[PDB]
Amino acid sequence: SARNEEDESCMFALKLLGGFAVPFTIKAVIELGVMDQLLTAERAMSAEELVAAAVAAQLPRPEVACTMVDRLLRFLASHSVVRCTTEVVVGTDDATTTTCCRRSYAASPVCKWFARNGVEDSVLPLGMMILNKTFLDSWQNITDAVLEGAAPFEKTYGMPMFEYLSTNGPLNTVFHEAMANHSMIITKKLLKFFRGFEGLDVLVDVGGGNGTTLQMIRGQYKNMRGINYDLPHVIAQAAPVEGVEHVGGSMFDNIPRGNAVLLKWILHDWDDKACIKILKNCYTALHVRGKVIVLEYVVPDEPEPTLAAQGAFELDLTMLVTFGSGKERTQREFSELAMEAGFSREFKATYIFANVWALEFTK
Amino acid sequence: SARNEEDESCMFALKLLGGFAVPFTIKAVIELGVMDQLLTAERAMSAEELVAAAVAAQLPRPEVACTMVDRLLRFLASHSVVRCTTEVVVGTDDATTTTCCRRSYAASPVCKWFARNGVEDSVLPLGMMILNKTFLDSWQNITDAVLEGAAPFEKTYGMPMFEYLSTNGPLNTVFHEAMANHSMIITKKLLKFFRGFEGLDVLVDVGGGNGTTLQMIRGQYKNMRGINYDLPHVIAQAAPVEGVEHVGGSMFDNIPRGNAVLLKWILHDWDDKACIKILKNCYTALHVRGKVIVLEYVVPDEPEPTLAAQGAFELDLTMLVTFGSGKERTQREFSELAMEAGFSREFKATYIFANVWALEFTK
Ligand SMILES: NC(=O)c1ccc[n+]([C@@H]2O[C@H](COP(=O)([O-])OP(=O)(O)OC[C@H]3O[C@@H](n4cnc5c(N)ncnc54)[C@H](O)[C@@H]3O)[C@@H](O)[C@H]2O)c1
Ligand SMILES: NC(=O)c1ccc[n+]([C@@H]2O[C@H](COP(=O)([O-])OP(=O)(O)OC[C@H]3O[C@@H](n4cnc5c(N)ncnc54)[C@H](O)[C@@H]3O)[C@@H](O)[C@H]2O)c1
Ligand SMILES: Oc1ccc(/C=C/c2cc(O)cc(O)c2)cc1
Ligand SMILES: Oc1ccc(/C=C/c2cc(O)cc(O)c2)cc1
Ligand SMILES: [Cl-]
Ligand SMILES: [Cl-]
Ligand SMILES: [Cl-]
């Protein structure tokens, strides 16, 4: 009992230190093409069967590849990421790590989110960014960054992340593909569950990229016109989109005038002082009865041990790593920034999807 | 609800991809000195108090340091690693990330396992190895290593781990300190929970280092003599230990004669053929009724979703990453190695601590 408490404590400590193993194993199973074979399978498949289906090339050590994949999948099975069944081996099977016993694996429902197909909703492009080595290396440098009051990313690479992307075309692509993926999913869910675009004549999308988000919204709200507001080098590359003015500039200088401003994953990149500048520009830009629509996660008031709360605090540490002073906020924190920027004590919150809320502040 | 099912599924997918954040956060809290302040505190302490207690040097941006630490500990609290209490701030406090509310933190029981200073009951040296950048970087190269049937470490660094350690003095130290730490903990638990040293006249300790393990065992069993059998260059550096003879040699060539041979975390580094060679050298070194004592994890016959099983399969993946063909084994697998090496069909297993079993095979 006391023996067992000591034992359980030590095992929990080791579990806490080893949490990187699941993500890194999933990454390999995806990259090998094995996850996609699980996703299109009609039945449970052995590691040998999955390797044969995923990998076109002749392998130099095919049995060793098979036994390594078996071990990767066994581990994922113990975490319920895949389903496993075990059958007795008749004869010799060198493609299982256990001579006696052959495992076959099937996808769990969660695995659809790892689809490379793209056809239904997947978060694989976002996951490619989450586990990108460039970004992961920053997490090893938190200590020194904290002692300097700096972003771990900047301590690691010597410049802010957004500048770094200008210097690294491949990472720039990873980052933009991740953002576009998350944006597509959230915009679809917004159109299903959120009613705050009703009645709007003009929506200003800050960071609107090539105008795809506005295009999708305008598709549900045919009367609405859009202002796609983004940096000049972005706006330069945007093709014409029906009903949308592409406008270049900086949101710290000015925001175009409209009936609502959309801020999707913008404010969490910035400290309070910077957020108040943005929101003051929103305030001055809006017409009366106008709204800022903020699409962000919302951290709870206290550190609750729920899946949703842990997710929000994990994004907070991602913002800490990436930006230092970027951060996730509580509902109260968002309201306080809004009030500092001049908005009224009128607050709407609508839950959208995957920890994202739509928060609305009104002039 | 199909909506809520889809939402939970997606959040779960993201949780699975992000599991590295907790280990990296724990590493930073340890490195900063904050964890050791939690361990010695008399009461809950704010991030500001903890940074003041942990960091003697003046910081360039001390308020930013404190808010970052607050965010690291808030995340850990959401994972039950520390306890958190929240009190209303009177005045203005800019060393909490939430200006309304100041959190204070206290160690949970698990935190004692992260203690510095080589203290009683810590796995910190082992943890240093677990989260070492050189060793972690191999986990990014699993896909390509599988395709070649190679160890990820060897794919990453261009040679096996044991060879590479010879060329990297800091990493060699990290490795040996980790092994020594785990050995110390397990040896103390053995002396508490394991019977099998009783009646032994001579115990051979393969990989016995400087003879510390045999020294501890002799502490309890005064009439037992020890042979410390390690690589010649390790033996060269071992100071005399009463009742222990230091002997240099390859365990692949032979093993010194004794009443028992101890193999701790040896077999799991090696494939079946290499294990059978070691155990056959053990068999020749023993007389009838001599024993091999194997200290290893034991993986279950099916991938059970337990804390214990997940820990054993995680070590299996560590072996895959480090050695490729090193692996964790089932009880059946260990029995089948012993019988191949000539041992009798006579098998004892005693659970020790932190997933380690003592398995005994008899000649
Ligand atoms: N970061 C801080 O510590 C902090 C604190 C207070 C205020 N600020 C304000 O933020 C500035 C930092 O930015 P900068 O000087 O490089 O200016 P900038 O206008 O070039 O903006 C830099 C970043 O802002 C974002 N951005 C700007 N306009 C945007 C738009 N229309 N759509 C989408 N994203 C847009 C982009 O991500 C870009 O990389 C400070 O100089 C100050 O004005 C910063
Ligand atoms: N896979 C195998 O069967 C295998 C592997 C390596 C060496 N060997 C044989 O061993 C002989 C010597 O070759 P080598 O010098 O390259 O091997 P070695 O003696 O260096 O042994 C290889 C590894 O075994 C471990 N080791 C060896 N003896 C040990 C001991 N007493 N205590 C703890 N760890 C120990 C070390 O990690 C070492 O790096 C050769 O005959 C070789 O073929 C066989
Ligand atoms: O939780 C844990 C995580 C990792 C480890 C590693 C152990 C280990 C043991 C060896 O003999 C060699 C090695 O290179 C690594 C143990 C426990
Ligand atoms: O589960 C998740 C893990 C990581 C992320 C990262 C989001 C993100 C958002 C930004 O606006 C900028 C950025 O650099 C990163 C989101 C979800
Ligand atoms: Cl092969
Ligand atoms: Cl520009
Ligand atoms: Cl400061």
Author numbering:
A (entry chain B), B (entry chain A): 15 to 377
Task: Provide the authors' original text about this structure.
To rationalize their different catalytic regioselectivities, structural analyses involving X-ray crystallography and computational methods were conducted. We solved the crystal structure of an SbSOMT-resveratrol-nicotinamide adenine dinucleotide (β-NAD) ternary complex (diffracted to 1.72 Å resolution, Fig. 4d; β-NAD was utilized as an additive to improve crystallization), an SbSOMT-resveratrol binary complex, and two ternary complexes reproduced with pinostilbene or pterostilbene (diffracted at 2.10 and 2.56 Å, respectively). All complexes were in high structural resemblance and depicted as a homodimer with an open conformation. Superimposition of SbSOMT and SbCOMT (PDB: 4PGH21) revealed their high structural similarity (RMSD = 2.322 Å), except that SbSOMT harbors an extended loop (Val103-Cys114) that forms a threonine-rich dimerization interface. Close examination of the SbSOMT substrate binding pocket within the SbSOMT-resveratrol-β-NAD complex provided further insights into the interactions between SbSOMT and its stilbene substrates. The pocket mainly comprised hydrophobic residues, and the stilbene backbone was secured by hydrophobic interactions with Met143, Ile144, Met175, Phe189, Met193, Trp279, Tyr311, Leu329, Met333, Thr336, in addition to Leu28 of the adjacent protomer. The apparent binding cavity was confined to fit the stilbene backbone in a planar configuration with minimal rotational flexibility. Of the three hydroxyl groups on resveratrol capable of forming hydrogen bonds, only the methyl-accepting 3-OH group (A-ring) formed direct hydrogen bonds to SbSOMT residues, including the catalytic residues His282 (2.80 Å) and Asp283 (3.26 Å). Other hydroxyl groups were shielded by water molecules and did not directly interact with SbSOMT. Overall, these structures depicted a productive substrate orientation within the substrate binding pocket which greatly favors A-ring O-methylation.
A stilbene O-methyltransferase, SbSOMT, is first shown to be indispensable for pathogen-inducible pterostilbene (3,5-bis-O-methylated) biosynthesis in sorghum (Sorghum bicolor). Phylogenetic analysis indicates the recruitment of genus-specific SOMTs from canonical caffeic acid O-methyltransferases (COMTs) after the divergence of Sorghum spp. from Saccharum spp. In recombinant enzyme assays, SbSOMT and COMTs regioselectively catalyze O-methylation of stilbene A-ring and B-ring respectively. Whilst SbSOMT shows global structural resemblance to SbCOMT, molecular characterizations illustrate two hydrophobic residues (Ile144/Phe337) crucial for substrate binding orientation leading to 3,5-bis-O-methylations in the A-ring. The catalytic residues of SbSOMT are highly conserved with all reported COMTs, including His282 as the key nucleophile, whereas Asp283, Glu310, and Glu342 collectively charge the basicity or confine His282 in its reactive conformation.
